[PDB]
Design an enzyme around this catalytic site. Structure first.
Site, PDB file in Angstrom:
ATOM      1  N   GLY A   1       0.812  -1.207   0.000  1.00  0.00           N
ATOM      2  CA  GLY A   1       0.000   0.000   0.000  1.00  0.00           C
ATOM      3  C   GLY A   1       0.849   1.262   0.000  1.00  0.00           C
ATOM      4  O   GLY A   1       0.527   2.242  -0.677  1.00  0.00           O
TER       5      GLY A   1
ATOM      6  N   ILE B   1      -6.477 -18.064  -4.588  1.00  0.00           N
ATOM      7  CA  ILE B   1      -7.643 -18.161  -5.457  1.00  0.00           C
ATOM      8  C   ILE B   1      -8.404 -16.847  -5.635  1.00  0.00           C
ATOM      9  O   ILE B   1      -8.766 -16.488  -6.746  1.00  0.00           O
ATOM     10  CB  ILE B   1      -8.614 -19.266  -4.931  1.00  0.00           C
ATOM     11  CG1 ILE B   1      -7.950 -20.642  -5.053  1.00  0.00           C
ATOM     12  CG2 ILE B   1      -9.914 -19.268  -5.716  1.00  0.00           C
ATOM     13  CD1 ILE B   1      -8.832 -21.803  -4.591  1.00  0.00           C
TER      14      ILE B   1
ATOM     15  N   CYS C   1     -15.182  13.077  17.235  1.00  0.00           N
ATOM     16  CA  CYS C   1     -16.392  12.245  17.208  1.00  0.00           C
ATOM     17  C   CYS C   1     -16.896  11.960  18.632  1.00  0.00           C
ATOM     18  O   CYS C   1     -17.444  12.840  19.275  1.00  0.00           O
ATOM     19  CB  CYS C   1     -16.127  10.929  16.464  1.00  0.00           C
ATOM     20  SG  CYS C   1     -17.601   9.898  16.244  1.00  0.00           S
TER      21      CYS C   1
ATOM     22  N   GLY D   1     -15.226  11.741  21.152  1.00  0.00           N
ATOM     23  CA  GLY D   1     -14.476  12.631  22.022  1.00  0.00           C
ATOM     24  C   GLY D   1     -15.208  13.926  22.331  1.00  0.00           C
ATOM     25  O   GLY D   1     -15.070  14.482  23.427  1.00  0.00           O
ATOM     26  N   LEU D   2     -15.977  14.424  21.366  1.00  0.00           N
ATOM     27  CA  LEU D   2     -16.733  15.653  21.568  1.00  0.00           C
ATOM     28  C   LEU D   2     -17.933  15.357  22.446  1.00  0.00           C
ATOM     29  O   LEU D   2     -18.248  16.115  23.356  1.00  0.00           O
ATOM     30  CB  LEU D   2     -17.204  16.228  20.228  1.00  0.00           C
ATOM     31  CG  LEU D   2     -18.205  17.384  20.318  1.00  0.00           C
ATOM     32  CD1 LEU D   2     -18.108  18.253  19.085  1.00  0.00           C
ATOM     33  CD2 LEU D   2     -19.608  16.842  20.479  1.00  0.00           C
ATOM     34  N   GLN D   3     -18.599  14.248  22.164  1.00  0.00           N
ATOM     35  CA  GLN D   3     -19.768  13.849  22.918  1.00  0.00           C
ATOM     36  C   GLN D   3     -19.420  13.627  24.383  1.00  0.00           C
ATOM     37  O   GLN D   3     -20.175  14.004  25.276  1.00  0.00           O
ATOM     38  CB  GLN D   3     -20.354  12.579  22.315  1.00  0.00           C
ATOM     39  CG  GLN D   3     -20.805  12.762  20.879  1.00  0.00           C
ATOM     40  CD  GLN D   3     -21.211  11.461  20.228  1.00  0.00           C
ATOM     41  OE1 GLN D   3     -21.271  10.398  21.015  1.00  0.00           O
ATOM     42  NE2 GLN D   3     -21.471  11.412  19.031  1.00  0.00           N
TER      43      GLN D   3
ATOM     44  N   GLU E   1     -26.831   6.299  23.553  1.00  0.00           N
ATOM     45  CA  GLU E   1     -26.065   5.224  22.931  1.00  0.00           C
ATOM     46  C   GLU E   1     -25.562   4.323  24.041  1.00  0.00           C
ATOM     47  O   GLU E   1     -25.533   3.098  23.910  1.00  0.00           O
ATOM     48  CB  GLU E   1     -24.865   5.804  22.165  1.00  0.00           C
ATOM     49  CG  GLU E   1     -24.192   4.836  21.203  1.00  0.00           C
ATOM     50  CD  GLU E   1     -22.894   5.388  20.607  1.00  0.00           C
ATOM     51  OE1 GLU E   1     -22.823   6.601  20.320  1.00  0.00           O
ATOM     52  OE2 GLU E   1     -21.943   4.603  20.408  1.00  0.00           O
TER      53      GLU E   1
ATOM     54  N   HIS F   1     -14.461  13.708  11.781  1.00  0.00           N
ATOM     55  CA  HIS F   1     -13.159  13.073  11.894  1.00  0.00           C
ATOM     56  C   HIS F   1     -12.182  13.928  11.083  1.00  0.00           C
ATOM     57  O   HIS F   1     -11.961  13.673   9.897  1.00  0.00           O
ATOM     58  CB  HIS F   1     -13.180  11.656  11.298  1.00  0.00           C
ATOM     59  CG  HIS F   1     -13.674  10.594  12.235  1.00  0.00           C
ATOM     60  ND1 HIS F   1     -12.958  10.180  13.340  1.00  0.00           N
ATOM     61  CD2 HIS F   1     -14.791   9.829  12.204  1.00  0.00           C
ATOM     62  CE1 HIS F   1     -13.612   9.207  13.948  1.00  0.00           C
ATOM     63  NE2 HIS F   1     -14.726   8.973  13.278  1.00  0.00           N
TER      64      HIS F   1
ATOM     65  N   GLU G   1      -9.061  13.925  11.130  1.00  0.00           N
ATOM     66  CA  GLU G   1      -7.858  13.156  10.783  1.00  0.00           C
ATOM     67  C   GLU G   1      -7.937  12.717   9.326  1.00  0.00           C
ATOM     68  O   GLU G   1      -6.939  12.710   8.613  1.00  0.00           O
ATOM     69  CB  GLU G   1      -7.718  11.857  11.599  1.00  0.00           C
ATOM     70  CG  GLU G   1      -8.323  11.819  12.969  1.00  0.00           C
ATOM     71  CD  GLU G   1      -9.815  11.623  12.944  1.00  0.00           C
ATOM     72  OE1 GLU G   1     -10.519  12.577  12.591  1.00  0.00           O
ATOM     73  OE2 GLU G   1     -10.287  10.519  13.276  1.00  0.00           O
TER      74      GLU G   1
END
Lengths: 531, 531, 531
Positions: free
Chosen positions: C19, C150, C374, C376-378, C398, C505, C507
């Site tokens: 990659g 395969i 994400c 982290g803010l909540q 959640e 996000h 990042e």
């Protein structure tokens, strides 16, 4: 009862320790009371290791019958504790030459001769003939090279044919592969591909051994089993280890021995591995430790058997023998170069002679244990002749063909046999030891056999003189087939802790179960010197 | 300018006419003015076809230099119209023996010798050496065996290495495969698999030729092209045909010649195939037709070159020569067995002699054209000696070593050379033809060369006598290297339409472009007899 | 001008950094001014990375268009500096589903549909379509999986067909293999076998890259070249390195870039690699060093892009950012756990919430730089609501669907769109930053796009209250397609060195050439705290 055949192939890459694997399985089988033998197939074109560098690019072993073979044979003799012959090292050159000679002589009765079945027939017949004369119930055959290459093809095919020829239950196939370890992840893809290529040429391994840094966990081994068609219980690990002698113990532990017995339809026999267990105990927990120097002309595996002899000796002395490599051909600096040394060993060879001469002088004058093998004896003879017998510029005609004193020269014409001129002495030669000597004290017998590989001998004519100057001839050879009758086999000095030299290669016959006496003494004396 | 190499391999199955393919491409290249040569690789272990049955399981060709090679060499000489040597038939035995001898002599300077690069180097060097001495700009190399087998592996690898060694534009690779035809459906799967296996060993064919009952249509050829990586325009057909001489004409028609020129970076040259075109015209539309009988000891390809000579002759006579096979060794029935025959030919061999003797008598007494080759001459000599010279039980010591009249025996001791005893005469031997004879009328020269392969000669001592009884010696050999000086090369009878015998094998030198005179006469006389 | 295709395959084993190889070649090509793109083929059956664990077994990247793809796409965007789409991650599930749907709808007009040509056509068409819309002159395609297995077979075949479809000079093939290093001996056998298997499926690599601990010497590389059919100058090394950014610089140095240009028939362009050179200089010689803690729920590659963002940030600050992993879900021990830390970062997830809540409290009360992504803010919203707004047991439905204060819950029904219920927000969403805030100070703009992947939002109803307690909403979303209009995108505190949280996000969009502002600030503040 039917003879059993265990074939061993390698895949992915070479250098996976397949030779020690063969040797280790052979030992496991011997520890069960079976009469065994091993055959090393070397796909190279060389007829034998005769035209190859004897030390340089790896040691060339020598069998009791005078055959110059690949070094694996030495691994086999040491682990199986037995004498092998030239029939135990099969090569492409042997097989093709032998087959080509037969058709030129019209022995194939006008048929067109081909790799299959003619070259392959020749191969199987050679495997059976050797196993026959050595009366083995189980024969372990190692195929050199790597599955997937062109050279080993005739051999993989030959051994595939054994299954049908021998009938069910009499043949077993093992394949050794590389399993790289990254992550803590084991990469099984290479062995999957190797086995698949193997099946492609017509062979289905019964047992797999996976070489890797550490043992391959059960989860991974099971996965490999299912995609290769091999029973989960028939997939084993071959982790890197500190001492080679650990290998058999390790493989038996996992159950390789059990698996082989079963696969061959032999009733379970509990192996006695007490020797290997003790040897590894002594190796991991030495009682003492002494370092000795090897003033060698070739400072890998050039001295495989040599280093093995020293190890067998250290065990017999419950001591770890540390080896210091002294170039020798490299001048005046003998005090530092031999400072932390308690023994000096000069091995065989055929350049840096003058450097070695100095190493012998130092060891003789400083009362340091000295062991000389092949050239090592000649050197000690050369430096003694110079510095004690006053023979100025004494030497071997090998290094100085114009020396005024050829104390060491080629086979005297008086002891030579028709058609054997220019041929060195090979294989076992009888040696008569002299009572009361150091030699005699070491062996404990008067007549023994030691293997040779050299074309130079101590000049008979200089013997009387050297003996008057104080040199002792503790052994000679009554000859063999009327050749070399009376030649000196060993020398030593009386006023010295340990100074001994032999014309043969005693390392070759050394076994873990039976250390070579000359080395046992060397290490012992070395320990004494250490205090 | 750079030498060009065109390699030809076969796949799926053998027996696809790869030899005629090689020969046909060679002819196409010669018809363009290039200096060409062909090398037949035979993966078998036999060093040469010397220890094989000379007729039984296929004919063994003999080159001008006395080499006993595979029969393809004969195909090459006829299509390329040139003399080849033993260097043009390369085998596994030659390559391995030659390499093994070198390392035993230590010529590999102590290295370990392997199939790669040593065996492969030997192979390439042999290919180049032969191409060098025969100064060829383009060399067509045919790899015997079938891709996918073990035996041809060293050779496929050797030729793969040529691409790199020779540089771009100087090497080309052709692969011949089988495309079975069912439905009217062509099955391309086998060639897809063959090519894939080929690429696997490292070779990518540039050109494909598909063997099948009928030509493979463009649609199918295109599909094969795309899955093999070969340009659509580089996929050709090889349909079964009535006359072999059609092959080159057919391949050129599709554009194989054009494709090869381009692929090799050579500027287009318009080939002159007028000869092949005319020969095929004569073959498809014979002017006349005559049948002759071959009283052979081996009643396939045992008489390949023989049958070829007759065909070249029929063309020169614009007549289709039909061949009747008479066992000969099978008794009194010569009237029916030779009824619809206009010529009797007795070929070579080394059993049914008495049966052949009868065939010669009948042909001599009934005024039937008779041609005797090798044994055929000896037989005519034997029956003449008996029935005309009154030599009771005359024979060759080959069949009757105790005959009272060895009119035919081994090389007289007077004409033998040191170290050559027991070795037959091989290759070209000079023949001095006698003016005014039938022989002389056929060739038109006094000195010519014809190839031999026999160890029996007409006994010098019986010559004078046989000549008085009416036998004519129209040719002898001044000898060669001081051997066989004066030996009889041909015989004939004056009061007969056509009775001729030669000790050599004139079929061997026969070419489509140059029929062998002895055969041209035979067919001509046969036609006369027919009226 | 013709579009160029560079295909990259892997052999022997996976995990060779294929990659980063694709990414590094893409960067080399971009540094030359070409318009490029990369496509990651993942042979797995998953249609996309949507149903896979978003962090657990590796990070799932998210493209601007909301596609959930394999993590390599992130490597591509960062090295090529560009936005990719879902068309850049091709899988078996996509190709087969798409083809199966077409034949059930009868779109294949009644023909029998097969892997070849239908599945393969689909694959090539998908590669071309994506390259078309992104107008690339050169497209680098990476085939996932390992040659010899395969799963990748349909894809290796599809790309093989490109050579013919595109014409000469427009396609190039690279193959990456493992070359284990023992002895100082490089084992080339595995790559010889891999390439041979590759040719077997019909592909001949043009360029080879050999992965090994250290660079493969020229002698070894040449040997590999000759047995693989690849030009010596087209065999390169891929040594393990300290910093990934070294790879492109290293490959260009050896001449990979030069080789690719030539092989594609493009006139040499001198690449400008100044950026990579400087980035590696800063990485090897940091000006300063600060450690920050990541209180993550998943304490490999789970935070690939996250860790990348921090690295891009450290470079922008000429500082080496050391990362400390704090389990968080593991109780009272916040003093030691955050001792040698100068910044606390709470990343995304969907268990150990209560543990993270504590980490935010500590960082808020102790004035420690805090960045929340994400979840982290909540979390910061949850702990603020509890300890500052006095909302007892405040939480996200959640984790606690029965909380008396769902300050964080699913998409409010008022802002939901028909048929989109229960679907999280994905891809780029517009964010309106509030002037004068920390956020605004970091970005420097009022409107920007950031990628999302979550189904929970700050409850609108609790906003007013939290703002009165001192919470600041420095950003919201005007919505998108009439969904989530007004949702909070970021929060922060005024009386604090650095306390910031974003719902997206950031990042994901971070690039080495353009660090994500939120991270640049985090690292900067962290340095301030350090003094």
């Amino acid at each position: 009862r039917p003879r059993k055949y265990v074939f061993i192939t390698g895949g992915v890459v070479s250098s996976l320790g397949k030779g020690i694997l063969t040797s280790s399985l052979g030992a496991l089988l011997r520890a069960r009371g079976y009469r065994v033998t091993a055959i090393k197939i070397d796909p190279y074109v060389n007829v034998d290791a005769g035209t190859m560098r004897p030390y340089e690019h790896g040691e060339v072993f020598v069998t009791a019958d005078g055959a110059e073979t690949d070094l694996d044979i030495g691994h086999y003799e040491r682990f199986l504790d037995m004498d092998l012959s030239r029939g135990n090292n099969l090569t492409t050159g042997q097989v093709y030459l032998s087959v080509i000679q037969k058709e030129r002589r019209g022995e194939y009765l006008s048929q067109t001769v081909q790799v299959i079945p003619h070259i392959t027939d020749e191969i199987k017949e050679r495997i059976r003939k050797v196993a026959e004369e050595q009366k083995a119930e189980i024969v372990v055959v190692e195929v050199g090279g790597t599955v997937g290459d062109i050279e080993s093809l005739p051999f993989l095919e030959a051994i595939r044919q054994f299954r049908f020829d021998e009938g069910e239950g009499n043949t077993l196939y093992l394949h050794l592969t590389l399993v790289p370890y990254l992550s803590e992840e084991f990469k099984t893809k290479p062995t999957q591909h190797s086995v698949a290529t193997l099946r492609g040429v017509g062979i289905q391994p019964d047992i797999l051994v996976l070489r890797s840094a550490r043992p391959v966990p059960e989860e991974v081994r099971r996965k490999v089993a299912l995609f290769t068609n091999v029973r989960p219980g028939h997939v084993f690990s071959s982790p890197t280890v500190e001492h080679l002698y650990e290998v058999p113990l390790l493989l038996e532990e996992q159950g390789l021995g059990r698996a082989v017995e079963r696969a061959l339809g032999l009733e379970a026999v509990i192996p006695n591995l007490s020797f290997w267990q003790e040897a590894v105990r002594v190796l991991k927990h030495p009682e003492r430790t002494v370092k000795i120097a090897i003033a060698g002309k070739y400072v890998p595996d050039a001295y495989l058997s040599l280093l093995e002899a020293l190890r067998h000796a250290g065990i017999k002395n419950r001591a770890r023998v540390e080896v210091k490599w002294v170039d020798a051909e490299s001048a005046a600096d003998l005090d530092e170069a031999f400072r932390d040394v308690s023994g000096i060993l000069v091995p065989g060879g055929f350049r840096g002679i003058e450097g070695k001469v100095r190493a012998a002088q130092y060891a003789r004058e400083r009362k340091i244990p000295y062991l000389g093998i092949c050239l090592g004896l000649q050197i000690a003879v050369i430096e003694f002749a110079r510095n004690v017998a006053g023979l100025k510029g004494a030497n071997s005609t090998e290094f100085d063909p114009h020396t005024p004193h050829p104390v060491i020269d080629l086979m005297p014409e008086q002891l030579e046999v028709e058609g054997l001129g220019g041929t060195m002495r090979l294989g076992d030669w009888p040696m008569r030891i002299k009572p009361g000597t150091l030699l005699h004290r070491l062996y404990g017998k008067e007549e023994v056999l030691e293997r040779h590989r050299h074309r130079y001998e101590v000049n008979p004519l200089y013997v009387d003189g050297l003996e008057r100057a104080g040199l002792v001839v503790s052994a000679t050879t009554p000859g063999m087939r009327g050749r070399g009758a009376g030649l000196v086999e060993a020398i030593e000095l009386k006023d010295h802790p340990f100074f001994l030299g032999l014309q043969s290669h005693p390392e070759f016959k050394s076994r873990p179960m039976r250390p070579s006496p000359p080395f046992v003494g060397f290490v012992e004396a070395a320990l004494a010197y250490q205090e």
